[PDB]
Paper text:
The henipaviruses possess an attachment (G) and a fusion (F) glycoprotein which together work in concert to mediate the virus attachment and entry process, but the precise triggering mechanism of paramyxovirus fusion has yet to be defined in detail. The henipavirus G glycoproteins have a type-II transmembrane topology, containing a short N-terminal cytoplasmic tail and a long C-terminal extracellular globular head. Distinct from most other members within the subfamily Paramyxovirinae, the henipavirus attachment glycoprotein does not hemagglutinate and neither binds to sialic acid, nor retains neuraminidase activity, and instead binds cell surface protein receptors. Recently, ephrin-B2 and ephrin-B3 were identified as the functional receptors for both HeV and NiV.
The high-resolution structures described here, including both HeV-G alone (2.2 Å) and in complex with ephrin-B2 (2.7 Å), combined with structure-based mutagenesis, reveal new insights into the molecular mechanisms governing the initial steps of henipavirus entry into host cells and into the paramyxovirus entry mechanism in general. HeV-G and ephrin-B2 form 1∶1 complex both in solution and in the crystals. Four copies of complex were observed in the asymmetric unit of the crystal. The complex buries an interface of 1272 Å2, slightly smaller than the 1354 Å2 buried in the NiV-G/ephrin-B3 complex and the 1393 Å2 - in NiV-G/ephrin-B2 complex. Thus, its glycosylation pattern is more physiologically relevant than in the previously published structures, which used ephrin expressed in either yeast, bacteria or in the presence of glycosylation inhibitor. In addition to the previously observed glycosylation site N36, we now observe another glycosylation site - N139, which is consistent with sequence-based predictions. Ephrin-B2 undergoes very minor conformational changes upon binding to HeV-G and its structure in the HeV-G/ephrin-B2 complex can be superimposed on the unbound ephrin-B2 structure with the root mean square deviation (RMSD) between equivalent Cα positions of approximately 0.5 Å. The only region on ephrin-B2 that shows some rearrangements upon HeV-G binding is the G-H loop.
Author numbering:
A (entry chain A): 174 to 204, 213 to 602
B (entry chain B): 27 to 65, 72 to 92, 95 to 167
């Protein structure tokens, strides 16, 4: 028997595996003029990584005030419910220059990869961005008078980007495989060097779509200088002295524009999630066939999508030239039946009505609202784990109700039920 | 607490006054639909622009609506809140003014016109005074 919080591995207690329309899920909430934004959550081995940016004013265009990068532990709060406790917090000096952080756990530390820019978000100012990456290492259990043990910068000697001009982390969390860490990343490729056959664009059954739409939707607009390609940044700790990050591109199997992504281990194998930021609006997740080169075995899911805008709203499947959507990941909790848990936004074109759902490729077995309808919600990050062999999920949800003073993320704890009736 | 009344973006809409267009006054939390109706079809690209671009009837941006499908109903919904599926930072701030225009001449050959068009000739423009009156 194993007590405490631990990775979703081995043989957990079985979970309810048929469709139920009644509420059997019970979300538990865990612990002026400001908006807290750009959130990150990672849960690995009883520890977690967290980050956010505090802004004065709007969440989009407010003045960046404080960046928090913290780690902690996930524990039994005594009553058989997980809760989170911060142990080590770091606030870098210039909050407006830190972008797109990504955290991966390895035994004593979380390693957090960020992008540094003096021109804003590299995605929105790609051509003016000078690629610059930062690495901060944080001990999950800090020690007094331990030198560089608690907090450490790591200087990156070399970046191996292949044919790409620029690369940077793109997504909340990555994994370790032995002593090698992988971060979700994105590569910047000039359109003139992009190798693509326009005849792979699936325009049959879409009379208004044209063969060029897929290639044109590989960048943030039709005439972007770059296209964005998802992948991984690889950091092999076993090497001596050398901090080298190499980019590993994702395969062109069900290719979509590079978007924030997550690679995680569930029941012992790597799983991948890529946000749907263009015309292919059905959820993109699946088991990883190969890590290098990165290849994802995408599920053929017909139940989960994301809100969009006019051109590619929720449930759009026909190739259009669009760049819109939300990041709402899902976490594989049973490979034998391929059931995952995650939060989706139950709206066609608006960021509202968050719903926690447990689902299969072609059906949602059970779900529950996290708030009321017309409650505003955005990015959601889900990680599920074991608490004395019961599957639990923790979801970070960007959420607020109209009229709130403070826009803040919330943490939700959901126990996955064992029996369905 | 409300869903505002939908705006049909076609020339026969009488709520676009001559020379003035439509003025709205939506409040924080409202929802709005801008619909390009189903079908002789009118073709538009509809944009959100600044005060100066609306007064001179010019565009220079990614459209909010791309009405080039005579077969289908195209819809755009806004909730006047901080969060959005827009990746360019679409937000609506109370006591701020937002302008929606189209520079198309209505024909398929004029979808991408960048001056004049149906904004200065039909006053097919929306003025949203967010969180006012
Ligand atoms: C949110 O958006 C949903 C998706 O909208 C659609 O997709 C996006 C990407 C855009 O392309 C939009 O323009 C699309 O509308 C929307 O749900 C859609 O709602 C449609 C009705 O408005 C509905 O019906 C249409 O298709 C059927 C046939 O459907 C077949 O295939 C699916 C695929 O699995 C099957 O599941 C279905 O069972 C069907 O077999 C048409 O028959 C129907 O039309 C009529 O059919 C005539 C043929 O004889 C035709 O000439 C004539 O046009 C008739 O009107 C529709 O055209 C879609 O099936 C549905 N899609 C999904 C995925 O659910 C949501 O609508 C809800 O809105 C409320 C108000 C209500 O209308 C509900 O029906 C609907 O679920 C959108 N939600 C909101 C809140 O707006
Ligand atoms: C990470 O780096 C280590 C260090 O080189 C790699 O391990 C070695 O790799 C080669 C090829 O497998 C062997 O010939 C060496 O004998 C290995 N030595 C040791 C001590 O492991 C490792 O393969 C690298 N892993 C990744 C994923 O890059
Ligand atoms: C999702 O659907 C695609 C297409 O239906 C599947 O791809 C097929 O996979 C089989 C087995 O690997 C191949 O023999 C076919 O050639 C593939 N292409 C087809 C049928 O067009 C894919 O395997 C499906 N993925 C999952 C997880 O079910
Ligand atoms: C992009 O970079 C330029 C400097 O090259 C800067 O002046 C401009 O404000 C930036 N804009 C955005 C949207 O990042
Ligand atoms: C694109 O694919 C088609 C058929 O799959 C092939 O005949 C064609 O040569 C390809 N295009 C190029 C430029 O090679
Ligand atoms: C629309 O504009 C194009 C040029 O931009 C012009 O050639 C065409 O005749 C115009 N059509 C109408 C109906 O105004």
């Amino acid at each position: 028997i194993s007590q405490g919080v631990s990775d979703l591995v081995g043989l957990p207690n079985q979970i309810c595996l048929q469709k139920t329309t009644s509420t059997i899920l019970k979300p538990r909430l865990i612990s002026e003029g400001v908006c807290i934004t750009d959130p990150l959550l990672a849960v690995d081995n009883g520890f977690f990584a967290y980050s956010h940016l505090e802004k004065i004013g709007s969440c989009t265009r407010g003045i960046a005030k404080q960046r928090i990068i913290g780690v902690g532990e996930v524990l039994d709060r005594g009553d058989k419910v997980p809760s989170m406790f911060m142990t080590n917090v770091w606030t870098p000096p210039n909050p407006s220059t830190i972008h797109h952080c990504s955290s991966t756990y390895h035994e004593d530390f979380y390693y957090t990869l960020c992008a540094v820019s003096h021109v804003g978000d590299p995605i929105l100012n790609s051509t003016s961005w000078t690629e610059s990456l930062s690495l901060i290492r944080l001990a999950v259990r800090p020690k007094s008078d331990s030198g560089d043990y608690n907090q450490k910068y790591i200087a990156i000697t070399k970046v191996e980007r292949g044919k790409y001009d620029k690369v940077m982390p793109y997504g909340p969390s990555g994994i370790k495989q032995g002593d090698t860490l992988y971060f979700p990343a994105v590569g910047f490729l000039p359109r003139t060097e992009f190798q693509y056959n326009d005849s792979n664009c699936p325009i049959i059954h879409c009379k208004y779509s044209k063969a060029e739409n897929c290639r044109l939707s590989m960048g943030v607009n039709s005439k972007s200088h770059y296209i964005l390609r998802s992948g991984l940044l690889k950091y092999n700790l076993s090497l001596g002295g050398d901090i080298i990050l190499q980019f590993i591109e994702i395969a062109d199997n069900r290719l979509t524009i590079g978007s924030p992504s997550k690679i995680y281990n569930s029941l012992g194998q790597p799983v991948f999630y890529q946000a749907s930021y263009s015309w292919d609006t059905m959820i993109k997740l699946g088991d990883v066939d190969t890590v290098d080169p990165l290849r994802v075995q995408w599920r053929n899911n017909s139940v989960i999508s994301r809100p969009g805008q006019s051109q590619c709203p929720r449930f759009n499947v026909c190739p259009e030239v669009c760049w819109e959507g939300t990041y709402n990941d899902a976490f594989l909790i049973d490979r034998l039946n391929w059931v995952s848990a995650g939060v989706y936004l139950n709206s066609n074109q608006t960021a509202e009505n968050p719903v926690f759902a447990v689902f299969k490729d072609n059906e949602i077995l059970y779900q529950v609202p996290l708030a009321e309808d017309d409650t505003n919600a955005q990015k959601t990050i889900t990680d599920c784990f074991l608490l004395e062999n019961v599957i639990w999920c923790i979801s970070l949800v960007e959420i607020y109700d109209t009229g709130d003073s403070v826009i803040r993320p919330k943490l939700f704890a959901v126990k996955i039920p064992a029996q369905c009736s | 607490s409300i869903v505002l009344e939908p705006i049909y973006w076609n020339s026969s809409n009488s709520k676009f006054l001559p020379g003035q267009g439509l003025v709205l006054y939506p409040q924080i939390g409202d929802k709005l639909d801008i619909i390009c109706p189903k079908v002789q079809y009118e073709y538009y690209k509809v944009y959100m622009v600044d005060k100066d671009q609306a007064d001179r009837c010019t565009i220079k941006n990614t459209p909010l609506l791309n009405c080039a499908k005579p077969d289908q109903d195209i819809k755009f919904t806004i909730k006047f809140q901080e969060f959005s599926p827009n990746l360019w930072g679409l937000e609506f701030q109370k006591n701020k003014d937002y302008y929606i225009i189209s520079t198309s001449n209505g024909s398929l050959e004029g979808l991408d016109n960048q001056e004049g068009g149906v904004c200065q000739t039909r006053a097919m423009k929306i003025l949203m005074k967010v969180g006012q009156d």
